[PDB]
Curated annotation (Swiss-Prot), chain A:
List of catalytic residues: 50
Phylogenetic placement of the source organism: Bacteria, Pseudomonadati, Pseudomonadota, Gammaproteobacteria, Thiotrichales
Record keywords: Cytoplasm, Lipid A biosynthesis, Lipid biosynthesis, Lipid metabolism, Lyase
Stretches of the chain forming a coiled coil according to its record: none
Subcellular localization: Cytoplasm
Gene Ontology process terms (BP): fatty acid biosynthetic process; lipid A biosynthetic process
Name of protein: 3-hydroxyacyl-[acyl-carrier-protein] dehydratase FabZ
Swiss-Prot record, chain B:
GO MF entries: (3R)-hydroxyacyl-[acyl-carrier-protein] dehydratase activity
Domain of life: Bacteria
Active site (catalytic residues): 50
Catalytic activity entry: a (3R)-hydroxyacyl-[ACP] = a (2E)-enoyl-[ACP] + H2O
Record InterPro entries: FabA_FabZ, FabZ, HotDog_dom_sf
Keyword Nucleus: no
Keywords for the protein's UniProt record, in alphabetical order: Cytoplasm, Lipid A biosynthesis, Lipid biosynthesis, Lipid metabolism, Lyase
This protein's record includes keyword Lipid metabolism: yes
Identification of the protein by name: 3-hydroxyacyl-[acyl-carrier-protein] dehydratase FabZ
Species of provenance: Francisella tularensis subsp. tularensis (strain SCHU S4 / Schu 4)
Biological role stated in the UniProt entry: Involved in unsaturated fatty acids biosynthesis. Catalyzes the dehydration of short chain beta-hydroxyacyl-ACPs and long chain saturated and unsaturated beta-hydroxyacyl-ACPs.
Amino acid sequence: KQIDVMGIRKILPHRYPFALLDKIVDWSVEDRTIVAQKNVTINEDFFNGHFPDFPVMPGVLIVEAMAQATAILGELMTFMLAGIDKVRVKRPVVPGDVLVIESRMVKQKNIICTAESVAKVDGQIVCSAELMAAY
Amino acid sequence: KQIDVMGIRKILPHRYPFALLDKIVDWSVEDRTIVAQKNVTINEDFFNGHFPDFPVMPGVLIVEAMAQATAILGELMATFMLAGIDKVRVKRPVVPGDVLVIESRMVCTAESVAKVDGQIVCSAELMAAY
Amino acid sequence: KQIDVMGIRKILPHRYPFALLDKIVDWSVEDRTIVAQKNVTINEDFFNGHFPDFPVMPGVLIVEAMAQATAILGELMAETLFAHVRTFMLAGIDKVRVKRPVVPGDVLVIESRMVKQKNIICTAESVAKVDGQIVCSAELMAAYKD
Amino acid sequence: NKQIDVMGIRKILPHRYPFALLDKIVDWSVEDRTIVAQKNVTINEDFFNGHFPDFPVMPGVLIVEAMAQATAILGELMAETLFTFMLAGIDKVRVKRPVVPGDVLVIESRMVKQKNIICTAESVAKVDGQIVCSAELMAAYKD
Amino acid sequence: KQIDVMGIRKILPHRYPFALLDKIVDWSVEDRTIVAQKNVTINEDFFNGHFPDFPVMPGVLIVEAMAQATAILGELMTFMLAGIDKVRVKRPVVPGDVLVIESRMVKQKNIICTAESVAKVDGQIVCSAELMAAYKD
Amino acid sequence: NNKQIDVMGIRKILPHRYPFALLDKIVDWSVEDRTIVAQKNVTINEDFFNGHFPDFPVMPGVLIVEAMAQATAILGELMATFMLAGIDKVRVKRPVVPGDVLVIESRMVKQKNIICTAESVAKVDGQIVCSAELMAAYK
């Protein structure tokens, strides 16, 4: 139950600079669960503008990654983003942080789906979110 | 009333590829409001990935614009970071050629709407912290 | 008579970073005119270099957008245009006047009119306006070459 | 003596990547009011990805912009004895051959008119000593 | 013991797209050793061209990451790469791999310096090499 | 002239594409002598120069090495993709800055099943700036 970047490409149409997932560590047909890894390095173009004197990762991008993680799970049952409720960002994600991303389905309401995602670095909670995504 | 992209650079520390506001057209301290503009063009790198064969502005970049709009109004109240983001409604596809007008009303927290040619494309509630 | 970016691509081979037209607002084969639109934003790579202390669009990228709009017009008319006869590639530029700095947040409205045809060489006269103020005008020669 | 490397060129003009389109000055002369500059053309410039995906050729406007930067440099070199330079006018541009990766673009510019904050040049770009493009350029010195 | 990316920018002039180290995990001037990390993701420009159809990290950039951890260890005791030898590439390195870089200073004859280096993914060696750096300014 | 290959020809031979396409053209080659001569122009408009170094642009020596290896892989292709099995004896002598033209010469010295060994040098203005010994595998 391993999907590397190449498998992920057959699944989503996202590509550089908006493929924000490196691999799928594990997936659950049954549990409607997924876990993804996005590695975070100084050598990604956003870190130049956000921010010049302090590389931090855009929250919205973590969310986009959770979203992309959510979107894949879907395709395993495209899937564009319809909404994103309750989103809270506890910790700065920097270059070096491996980013581990868990996303679970909770609502299947007629060609729409909803998910809860949490994002962690060394186990800690850096971000959680409710993601709403359809098609 | 207005603030050009060089004014935005003295207020916020953001830069390329994450300066997502071209200019501030209005604001008002009294009223706790701001209107900003984000021009959208095929010549922005994110469209090469999102997606080949159909370039559409990703939802989350709409929010980030909204957030910078917000965090400038904020800075006029006297840098901010994005704590909470809530009630995010992605109506329509934003495409190369659309002009994005950004309304942010403070109520720190805020209500923001993003428009193309009158029409709402996005709305969201935005908590935020230094 | 509107053509979105996806439409431009069927017509012009240009892709990023040298696709400098968002959409065609209007065309007329009968009138040999075209209106195009280029949105100018600070999220464009060239604004980092021209200039780092003060982003303003390069004169020559304005011209290039004029040239692209003229080549779409060119294509749309190739049955008319080339009655008596593969991409349109710029062969001359002549009456270029740059009147105003074009800055991020300007919408760039581009008018091009084809005024001369001569055995594969096309001449158009273009102007570009920001908030209906004249920002640049040019005479473009394109050759329908390989 | 009459060379200026890319770092010298950085102190003369504010242009940076991706609109720094000169690698070095080869010769100049305030006395003859001419300058010889060089831009190397390589596949590993980004504009080649879009112009064109299946046939990389250097856009004509960029050759012109190379010539105007060389002209602006000549202007700056001549400033003391004429009194930033911005491109006000372009005329008579002829694009003569396609320029492709691996071509060394040698650029010659000669200042012909001084007319009150407005300068005016003739300029040619060459590849292997043959002309790929010519132009008259009109820069205006303004802050 | 640790140095974040910010600390790294004070020691080395390298910047994007040639900053090839995220952080120093540890060092030791006594043993003359350094361990670095470099995260490998699909979001990195060089993966577009190497290769479209199969993104794999260029050997020569793995080496450049080695030479950069080395250069740090150097100033912890600019360093310009003057020699490379016995470079062996074992294993391809792809998006998702975390890339641990260990360098160890071997010789320090005058102004020329020399290191032994290794790069690893999940513990196994993916590349090794001997590097010669001169401290030319 | 019968022995030139432009960038669109290099593309048919090697999968490397931007930003890791590092040869502009092949200038000469002998299938009999086991040689190739290629060129790579170097210019300020290359993105690595914004990082290497911000206040002083000079070509990473690893990139000179990568240009050599591509040259070497084209020659291997022409004698017959080749991957970079080994790099030995790399001398980085002179710094390479915008405005220089890298002339690259590769010489196939030995072979040992798929693994192949070349001697390779890099030239600016007839002077050597970099030399090395390369082991590419695969055929």
